[PDB]
Amino acid sequence: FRKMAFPSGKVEGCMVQVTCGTTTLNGLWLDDTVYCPRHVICTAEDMLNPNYEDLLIRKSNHSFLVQAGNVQLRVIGHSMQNCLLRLKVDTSNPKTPKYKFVRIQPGQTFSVLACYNGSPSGVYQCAMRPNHTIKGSFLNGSCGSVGFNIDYDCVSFCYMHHMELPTGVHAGTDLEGKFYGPFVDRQTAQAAGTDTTITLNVLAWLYAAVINGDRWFLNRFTTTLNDFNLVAMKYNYEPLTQDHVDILGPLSAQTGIAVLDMCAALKELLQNGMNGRTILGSTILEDEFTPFDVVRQQ
Amino acid sequence: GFRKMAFPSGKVEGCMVQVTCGTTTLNGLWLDDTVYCPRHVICTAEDMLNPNYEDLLIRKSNHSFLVQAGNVQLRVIGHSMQNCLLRLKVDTSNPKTPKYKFVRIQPGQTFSVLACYNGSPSGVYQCAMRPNHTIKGSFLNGSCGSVGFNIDYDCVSFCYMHHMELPTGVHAGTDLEGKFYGPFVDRQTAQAAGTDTTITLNVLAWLYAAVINGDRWFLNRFTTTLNDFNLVAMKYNYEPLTQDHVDILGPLSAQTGIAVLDMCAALKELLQNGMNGRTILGSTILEDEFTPFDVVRQ
Numbered sequence: 001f002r003k004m005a006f007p008s009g010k011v012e013g014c015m016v017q018v019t020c021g022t023t024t025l026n027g028l029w030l031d032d033t034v035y036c037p038r039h040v041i042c043t044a045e046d047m048l049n050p051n052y053e054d055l056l057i058r059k060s061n062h063s064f065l066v067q068a069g070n071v072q073l074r075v076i077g078h079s080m081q082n083c084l085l086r087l088k089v090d091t092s093n094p095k096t097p098k099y100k101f102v103r104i105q106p107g108q109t110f111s112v113l114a115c116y117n118g119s120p121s122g123v124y125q126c127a128m129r130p131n132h133t134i135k136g137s138f139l140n141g142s143c144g145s146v147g148f149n150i151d152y153d154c155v156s157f158c159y160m161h162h163m164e165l166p167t168g169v170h171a172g173t174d175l176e177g178k179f180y181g182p183f184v185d186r187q188t189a190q191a192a193g194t195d196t197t198i199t200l201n202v203l204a205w206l207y208a209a210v211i212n213g214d215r216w217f218l219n220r221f222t223t224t225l226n227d228f229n230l231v232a233m234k235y236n237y238e239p240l241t242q243d244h245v246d247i248l249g250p251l252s253a254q255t256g257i258a259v260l261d262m263c264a265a266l267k268e269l270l271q272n273g274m275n276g277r278t279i280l281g282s283t284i285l286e287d288e289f290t291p292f293d294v295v296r297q298q
Numbered sequence: 299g300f301r302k303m304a305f306p307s308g309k310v311e312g313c314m315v316q317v318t319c320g321t322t323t324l325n326g327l328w329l330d331d332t333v334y335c336p337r338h339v340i341c342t343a344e345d346m347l348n349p350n351y352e353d354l355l356i357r358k359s360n361h362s363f364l365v366q367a368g369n370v371q372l373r374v375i376g377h378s379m380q381n382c383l384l385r386l387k388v389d390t391s392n393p394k395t396p397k398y399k400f401v402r403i404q405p406g407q408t409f410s411v412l413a414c415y416n417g418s419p420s421g422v423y424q425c426a427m428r429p430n431h432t433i434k435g436s437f438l439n440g441s442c443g444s445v446g447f448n449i450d451y452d453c454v455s456f457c458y459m460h461h462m463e464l465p466t467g468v469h470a471g472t473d474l475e476g477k478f479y480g481p482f483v484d485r486q487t488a489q490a491a492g493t494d495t496t497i498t499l500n501v502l503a504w505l506y507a508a509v510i511n512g513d514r515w516f517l518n519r520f521t522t523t524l525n526d527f528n529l530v531a532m533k534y535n536y537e538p539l540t541q542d543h544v545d546i547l548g549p550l551s552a553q554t555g556i557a558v559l560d561m562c563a564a565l566k567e568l569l570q571n572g573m574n575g576r577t578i579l580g581s582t583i584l585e586d587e588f589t590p591f592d593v594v595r596q
């Protein structure tokens with residue numbers, strides 16, 4: 001069982017470089033639109049608070065240097081959408097795939113194409129956390145990198161990188177420029193809400209461990225959903241919904257362990273702890289491996 | 299802020315095709331006017347237990363190879379075996395052919411895998427060639443012919459093509475010249491690898507990664523000689539350290555400011571006293587699938 005990313009070629013054909021003054025970041029080229037974080041226009045204005053509507057009226061189309069590989073693209077118009085700029089260019093991307101813009105929900109995963117200077121350097125898998133952060137790997141120059149999923153040749157773009165919190169996690173927006181979480185694009189230290197554990201995915205991981213022949217943690221206690229949810233919240237675990245219990249159906253049928261019986265297993269692990277025991281090799285319960293991942297890889 | 303990252307797969311995705319002989323369908327790699335694929339695409343369910351490839355191949359003509367690149371079908375105009383691969387000559391040269399080389403990777407080195415099913419890429423992940431010449435991959439039915447690769451600049455270095463899953467769940471395959479890594483043969487039999495060991499040079503590089511990411515709890519005032527460390531390493535199934543390895547860890551040592559043999563003393567302490575419930579870079583186990591080169595790049 002291992003975390004896999006979606007193949008990145010459909011997105012690589014869209015990455016570009018957007019430069020204002022001495023500041024440059026990544027943008028996404030779809031048809032005749034380039035999307036990028038709006039703070040490419042900042043010149044130290046980012047410190048404290050920038051007035052984006054003022055900075056933007058003060059900018060000409062010629063001040064935007066947009067480069068796709070070797071080619072410079074002429075900016076024909078610009079308008080601001082939330083925390084993103086939409087740049088109109090004179091040529092439509094010959095490599096635009098079928099795409100949509102989606103708002104990823106907590107607990108769901110996506111692939112990140114980390115880019116620097118409009119050039120992709122790496123691909124990895126991420127989870128949107130309940131507190132609306134992601135545990136990414138992003139260095140200076142990463143802003144504008146996108147997260148995405150791919151279904152039947154259609155790219156679902158769900159994220160654009162904007163910032164790294166003081167704790168080392170990362171924050172950003174969907175492709176309409178709406179931030180995930182309560183963060184704002186200014187140069188300030190910001191704090192995320194307490195980060196809860198994705199219970200649906202821990203449970204999925206437990207199911208994967210049982211499929212792997214590792215079942216020391218099972219027991220014969222019973223729990224109701226309500227009584228499991230009250231214990232889980234005491235340990236900063238997300239409560240389980242009835243939809244989540246359904247999502248776990250195929251895995252519970254495959255192993256013969258009823259979902260609520262696995263909850264009774266997890267409940268004991270929360271209350272008694274691992275005690276040095278290991279699950280799939282780790283003393284830590286993994287929560288970024290989804291039931292879909294377990295299902296596909298079993 | 300540190301994780302396994304795979305190379306962007308775009309240059310490789312544009313080379314994946316589908317090769318069919320009768321009921322059997324495998325992935326193939328299309329470079330210039332040649333398609334490479336595992337030779338047991340010519341196998342029926344009855345030839346698999348102990349087939350004679352020379353015999354089975356003399357019995358086929360170019361017409362019996364249906365090669366599909368996406369929608370398009372390419373005509374085979376010639377064929378030949380190279381070890382455990384077939385090389386099919388096609389009438390059209392792949393216009394998406396990247397700059398490339400064929401290399402044979404040595405144990406401990408890492409690469410990216412593009413997992414393909416029915417000629418179409420489905421996932422990408424990073425993995426390393428184990429000391430016992432297997433890879434700990436994620437390969438399902440229909441994955442044979444998927445390739446492993448590294449990218450330097452704009453040149454794809456192909457190093458792996460996938461053939462088989464051992465009963466232990468690890469995987470075996472060949473370089474692009476069709477020569478298998480390890481003691482394995484392409485037959486439908488249960489085969490065993492040698493006993494695996496831990497890649498010491500990679501654990502050390504990962505410990506440097508942790509120090510560079512601000513995880514220094516495991517460090518200690520002590521130091522050890524290479525010989526002393528090796529005696530300890532042998533006890534815990536770790537590859538012996540070599541002076542060349544220490545030279546490879548030169549640059550990491552300089553940035554960190556920690557002498558290599560100091561890091562070894564820390565590792566000796568982690569082997570002997572465990573991690574005490576502590577985690578390094580978010581992991582409860584000593585990661586050994588990051589090379590010194592990988593840590594630098596990130």
Ligand SMILES: COc1cccc2[nH]c(C(=O)N[C@@H](CC(C)C)C(=O)N[C@@H](C[C@@H]3CCNC3=O)C(=O)c3nc4ccccc4s3)cc12
Pocket residue numbers: 023024025037039040042046138139140141142143161162163164165166170184185186187188189190
């Ligand atoms: C340590 O806590 C802090 C305390 C006090 C202040 C702090 N600010 C930030 C913060 O993150 N600022 C944002 C930018 C703001 C405007 C959203 C930022 O630098 N984003 C990066 C990606 C970051 C960097 C490392 N990996 C992450 O992904 C991005 O490449 C961009 N670069 C530039 C460079 C020039 C112009 C625009 C951009 S936009 C953290 C922080």
Ligand SMILES: COc1cccc2[nH]c(C(=O)N[C@@H](CC(C)C)C(=O)N[C@@H](C[C@@H]3CCNC3=O)C(=O)c3nc4ccccc4s3)cc12
Pocket residue numbers: 322323324336338339341346437438439440441442443461462463464465469483484485486487488489
């Ligand atoms: C007594 O038999 C066993 C006993 C104990 C363990 C065992 N392992 C294997 C074994 O691996 N066989 C090879 C094939 C051999 C001949 C190279 C095989 O099926 N490879 C797969 C990838 C495999 C499949 C599951 N995940 C892995 O990645 C592959 O994608 C290919 N598929 C086909 C399908 C039809 C025709 C050709 C090919 S080539 C057999 C076996």
